[PDB]
Amino acid sequence: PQITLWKRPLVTIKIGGQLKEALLDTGADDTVIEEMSLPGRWKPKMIGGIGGFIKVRQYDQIIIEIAGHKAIGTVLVGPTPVNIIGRNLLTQIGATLNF
Amino acid sequence: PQITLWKRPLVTIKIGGQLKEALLDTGADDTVIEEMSLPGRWKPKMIGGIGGFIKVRQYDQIIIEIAGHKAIGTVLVGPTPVNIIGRNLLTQIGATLNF
Numbered sequence: 001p002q003i004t005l006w007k008r009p010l011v012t013i014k015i016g017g018q019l020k021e022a023l024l025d026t027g028a029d030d031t032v033i034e035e036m037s038l039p040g041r042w043k044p045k046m047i048g049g050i051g052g053f054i055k056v057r058q059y060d061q062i063i064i065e066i067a068g069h070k071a072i073g074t075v076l077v078g079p080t081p082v083n084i085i086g087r088n089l090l091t092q093i094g095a096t097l098n099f
Numbered sequence: 100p101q102i103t104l105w106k107r108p109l110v111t112i113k114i115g116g117q118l119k120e121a122l123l124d125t126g127a128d129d130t131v132i133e134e135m136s137l138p139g140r141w142k143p144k145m146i147g148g149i150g151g152f153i154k155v156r157q158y159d160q161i162i163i164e165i166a167g168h169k170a171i172g173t174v175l176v177g178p179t180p181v182n183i184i185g186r187n188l189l190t191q192i193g194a195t196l197n198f
């Protein structure tokens with residue numbers, strides 16, 4: 001698909017058996033999801049955004065389905081105001097910015 | 100161009116006759132630049148994201164070149180960690196997301 005940018009580029013994802021709405025975010029290195037449980041090992045991380053830093057849990061090797069496309073990668077879980085799909089997963093679904 | 104996302108989508112912008120680096124950011128509604136001088140009057144705004152928010156100065160109808168493409172629109176100036184080109188200007192340069 002081609003997604004215009006007149007509105008936020010929101011998509012449905014499936015993660016951890018749950019459906020969520022998330023923003024396709026070329027400005028995000030990593031994927032950051034609101035509080036939820038995920039299986040397996042995690043480690044803490046601090047990540048900076050516009051308003052300073054938040055503490056997150058880093059889960060590696062998490063499968064995800066983004067607007068129907070599967071991939072796998074690291075997911076950060078914590079108190080983000082928006083669920084964001086970052087470049088680490090956008091690459092895997094073949095997303096590009098075109099102009 | 101077609102910009103893949105294996106690295107950050109950094110481009111050169113020109114604003115006030117000077118070149119700066121900025122992130123093409125589909126997750127940003129608005130364009131936010133580090134402290135600089137711009138002409139005219141400004142209005143107040145707050146913009147929030149990961150970590151919380153920053154207070155910025157809103158300048159309207161500013162001439163800005165993004166990756167060689169000419170735009171004229173709103174620029175927010177304040178203590179952002181990174182210069183961000185948001186959807187207000189990405190739509191002026193004709194950018195879409197594609198996969």
Ligand SMILES: CC(C)CN(C[C@@H](O)[C@H](Cc1ccccc1)NC(=O)O[C@H]1C[C@@H]2C[C@H]3[C@H](OC[C@H]31)O2)S(=O)(=O)c1ccc2nc(NC3CC3)sc2c1
Nearest residue numbers: 027028029030047049050082126127128129146147148180
């Ligand atoms: C979080 C999203 C939803 C909004 N932001 C754009 C976003 O692309 C921001 C842009 C950004 C990049 C880096 C530092 C600060 C901001 N990305 C972001 O925080 O991603 C984090 C993810 C993790 C941790 C790190 C690493 O990569 C960067 C960073 O991986 S924002 O906070 O920078 C921003 C920008 C413009 C803007 N305009 C607004 N307009 C107001 C609503 C009417 S609100 C707003 C918020």
Ligand SMILES: [Cl-]
Nearest residue numbers: 072073074088
């Ligand atoms: Cl990853």
Ligand SMILES: [Cl-]
Nearest residue numbers: 091094103104
């Ligand atoms: Cl590729």
Ligand SMILES: [Cl-]
Nearest residue numbers: 172173187188
């Ligand atoms: Cl604008």
Ligand code: NA
Nearest residue numbers: 040041060061
């Ligand atoms: Na894991």
